[PDB]
Amino acid sequence: NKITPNLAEFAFSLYRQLAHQSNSTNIFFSPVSIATAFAMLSLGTKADTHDEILEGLNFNLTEIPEAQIHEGFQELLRTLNQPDSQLQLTTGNGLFLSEGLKLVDKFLEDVKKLYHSEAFTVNFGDTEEAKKQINDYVEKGTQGKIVDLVKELDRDTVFALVNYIFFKGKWERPFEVKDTEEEDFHVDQVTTVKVPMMKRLGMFNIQHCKKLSSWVLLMKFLGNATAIFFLPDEGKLQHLENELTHDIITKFLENEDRRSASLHLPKLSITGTYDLKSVLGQLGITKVFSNGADLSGVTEEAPLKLSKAVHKAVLTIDEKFLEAIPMSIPPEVKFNKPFVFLMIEQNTKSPLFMGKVVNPTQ
Template structure:
């Protein structure tokens, strides 16, 4: 009898934490000038410190949003990049004031009594810097852009902060010509995501004043590759009722594993070339909801600390997930309310409270 395998792949943006902990190429850098090496190392640790301050909040936001989405679509696949969403709203926070500002930052899971607004923006700046470091072994592109209505009088400070802190490119655009505006934005997103996101916006409102775009693209190769000759069609259990035949790659060997008796699930950690890892979480039959309910950063941290090398027969299906979310309702339920109403105070963008 074949064991039933339920596969849940957690893509919760925790790579940000991994990148903070381990900077690609940091340990094998050579330079003949000792002073330069000292200065560079000092600067790297400064970046890591700023970036690590964000990690707990970014992880909390990831799991809160995951829970919010799954509560309304319990049977659907879920796929999103939390760090991309956090970045987009943190950029918006640069132009927000009063309650609108507080709601955005607290909605992103930041404790404003422990972290100052400046520390949050500095943290994102350094996170973007670290994630975009060239790593010859994996491809990770993260970036931001600002599309502004022609003749929109924008405060110089907002534009400077967006560029300096979030490395955002700014473009003037005619939203009245909706077809051309959509093409300009969609072409930009398609190019930056290497053809993966082809229709970022549609049905644009001609009265739009500004669009903030945050994108992320990741492509990695396994540190220990799976052999193509070992890929065979096998049963994949989509849910309790649905079984489909899929190409399943296969590898026998030693992996970092942990069986969580309390949650009835197996956790496998696989390494990419470079400085990224993936967690595969395999709930026992009927335990999917129990595992999802327990998905918090503390659980993942506990799993990370419990992993040990163990022999396993690993099968992973080939799959493709595409998803689109309107985050407005989800974020309102998470406390980010004013920004979606006429009460929004975005006067830090144009100086105009009516924006």
């Protein structure tokens, strides 16, 4: 798992940028899917354009050879795309290129063979139809879950990238629907909103953590993925966000101690959509999106730049083995206020998703 530390740092860099920009909106994205897409894109770039991309993904190119970077991403893709995987994870990357470009066959082979991604030629002279073709590809790839992803295109577009991921979580230890009820969700310290709340009394990997000033709950999905939820104490959300580290997360994953608790966890149907040109530019990835871009691995003769780059991440969590409960007063742990969460792939320890729920009904 050579690249897992880098992906974790990229997750935190991206999260902290989005957390700073907006104070009251759900954050949800896939560090793995975004990094995979731009690692794939880097194969068509050279020189500063190439180096900016990998550095922006938190790889120090004076320390880690590029061969290890691509080997790590291909190993991660192998695990996620296992034919016998119960992880209901659908992800894809679509490259859309102007039909008038003479493309380099090596790049198209590398995209398809190494990164199992898709490249298409489109007539960007018809902006409305190119957008329809891009959005139809995503809609087909998600069986209708993601529709009309791209809302506008620049008239001078010759290259667009779409990265999507949809996860429908299945708990290893499910909830009972009979126990789900509407409950208050404290969006702030003096305001509440009613939302559907799953409930269960049982044995959980759960602990209060003084360093983070938060409850930390880990629950396993079917398919070798684990969710980690961070519930900040009153007035400690920003402290939690600042204090998070990869080492802190590794310690919790390694711990298997369990204890009884009365858990209240909201059902989640959340999405996040991001303009990666703007978001990744703030992380230092700029040349690939500009007229000076060195995309000569994609097209040798014509000028080229990436004009559009969109990420959408979609999550569904619901209620879908016998545990021994001691006869002592269990703590009541209610995720009825803003909380932070990650989803970790168990084999690689890589961060599949990171997010913050400020309002589940949003």
